[PDB]
């Protein structure tokens, strides 16, 4: 899969879970979507999201999260388990 | 008292999900032309044309507006011949012969294909079938067919079907079949331009629905709307008989029903995705493609009006079993315009 050291740009589509959820619960769902998307695509078993990504998502409230996030993903190996660290771009 | 007709038809009951997605043809017409009595394809989209009216009735000889459904039809592969005999009640299968070299993707539907089965054995089995058909124990002959979606890029898992042949005799039918097995059929070899067709398919799914939408029940008065019973019916029945009858409108599955439609005129059969008007060659695929269906590549039919089903669904056409006495002619009507503009 993606090599540990090298940092990759991913674009997370949040437009997908919109209309799956009530309007007032879209940002809390978008967070979990980011987590799962990044885990699946990095083949990671743990994920660590930044306060900057969170504050980006909640920039406008609980009703209008961005339709596409653009994140940088860098991976670490510790005890034979992959761990992603997510930042903005 | 006051009278009105009942709400809905009892002729399409039980209104239940279809046993299969591939439709089923129960009856076949009386044709003399020895030919296959049908074809199959995949539905692409709708558009409109303008044509000079050929059909009887005022509006004949004028320029009118005609909506049109495009049906994509790659060739079929004929892989089987199947005989039927007469039993105590009705027909019953008697023998089958298959072709030996079949595509690698047919095992996506028929997992258990034969192992040795070379041409030697194929020809021997054919001979047995012929020596049986020349005896007299035979009642009719049919062909076994499969589709080839790999050509248009739609899918790989194919569809398998059984079609009939025209004529009062069986040895002419066997000659036709023996000539056709192992090869491909194109729609121009079978269907004519101007025929009336019956279309057969499975309709779109709507889900579980209530009686207002599923049977045409009238919404109730605004006081009942404020009481909690607007989209409900009033009565499940009387006191005696002391049970609910099957004729009382209830909720349940709406859509995904096996339907048929009569007398849809075939207007044009095209080749390689283009329509050659009298003057010049033209394309049918609109700007930006069809919504929910891409570009048309192989072959296609223009059908007058509407047909049952969603876009990428499998359709089956046959020549009309219930035609009128005043038929329109069999020839491509004069077309003056075809819409290629964006349909999305």
């Amino acid at each position: 899969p993606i090599k540990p050291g090298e940092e990759v740009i991913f674009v997370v589509p949040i437009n997908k879970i919109k209309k799956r959820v009530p309007r007032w619960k879209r940002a809390p769902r978008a967070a979990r979507f980011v987590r799962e998307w990044i885990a699946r695509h990095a083949k990671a078993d743990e994920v660590i999201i930044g306060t900057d990504v969170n504050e980006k998502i909640w920039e406008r409230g609980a009703e209008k999260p961005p339709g596409k996030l653009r994140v940088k993903v860098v991976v670490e190996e510790s005890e034979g388990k992959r761990i992603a660290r997510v930042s903005l771009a | 008292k006051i009278h009105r007709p009942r709400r809905g038809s009892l002729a399409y009951s039980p209104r239940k999900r279809a046993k299969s997605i591939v439709p089923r043809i129960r009856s076949w017409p009386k044709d003399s032309e020895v030919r296959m009595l049908g074809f199959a394809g995949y539905k692409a989209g709708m558009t409109h044309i303008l044509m000079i009216d050929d059909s009887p009735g005022l509006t004949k000889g004028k320029e009118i507006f005609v909506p049109v459904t495009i049906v994509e039809v790659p060739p079929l592969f004929v892989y089987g011949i199947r005989a039927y005999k007469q039993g105590y009640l009705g027909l019953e299968t008697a023998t089958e012969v298959w072709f030996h070299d079949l595509h690698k993707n047919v095992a996506r539907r028929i997992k258990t294909l034969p192992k040795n089965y070379n041409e030697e054995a194929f020809q021997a089995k054919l001979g047995q079938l012929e020596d049986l058909v020349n005896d007299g124990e035979i009642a009719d002959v049919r062909l076994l067919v499969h589709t080839q979606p790999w050509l248009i890029g739609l899918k790989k898992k194919p569809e398998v079907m059984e079609y009939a042949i025209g004529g009062d005799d069986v040895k002419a039918k066997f000659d036709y079949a023996k000539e056709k097995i192992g090869k491909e059929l194109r729609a121009g070899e079978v269907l004519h331009e101007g025929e009336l067709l019956d279309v057969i398919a499975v309709t779109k799914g709507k889900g579980t629905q209530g009686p207002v939408k599923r049977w045409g029940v009238k919404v109730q008065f605004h006081k009942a709307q404020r009481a909690g019973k607007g989209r409900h019916i009033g009565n499940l029945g009387p006191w005696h008989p002391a049970r609910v009858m099957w004729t009382v409108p209830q909720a349940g599955q709406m859509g995904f029903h096996h339907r048929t439609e009569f007398n849809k005129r075939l207007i044009a059969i095209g080749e390689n995705g283009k329509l050659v008007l009298d003057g010049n060659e033209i394309e049918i695929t609109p700007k930006g493609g069809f919504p929910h269906y891409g570009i048309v590549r192989s072959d296609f039919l223009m059908i007058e009006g509407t047909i049952p089903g969603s876009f990428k669904r499998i359709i089956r056409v046959r020549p009309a079993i219930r035609p009128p006495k005043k038929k329109p002619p069999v020839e491509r009507p004069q077309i003056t315009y075809v819409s290629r503009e964006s349909k999305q």
Binding site: - | H48, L50, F65, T336, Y337, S339
Partner: protein, 62 residues
């Protein structure tokens, strides 16, 4: 098979579409879409909108 011309945004639109509006004085108008018709009867000026042709006809008069 005549291609008709919108009286709001000036473009040619295809057979089997659009609208004709008739006034009680016999004058006629053609409309390609719901938008052009609504803007007309609402009172908007197509001469300020860069997606019409009245815009170029005015660009001249500048």
């Amino acid at each position: 098979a005549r291609w008709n011309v919108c009286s709001y945004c000036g473009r040619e639109f295809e057979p089997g579409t659009g609208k004709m509006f008739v006034r009680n004085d016999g004058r006629v108008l053609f409309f390609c879409s719901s938008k052009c018709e609504k803007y007309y009867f609402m009172g908007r000026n197509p001469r300020k909108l860069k997606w019409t042709k009245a815009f170029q006809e005015a660009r001249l008069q500048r």
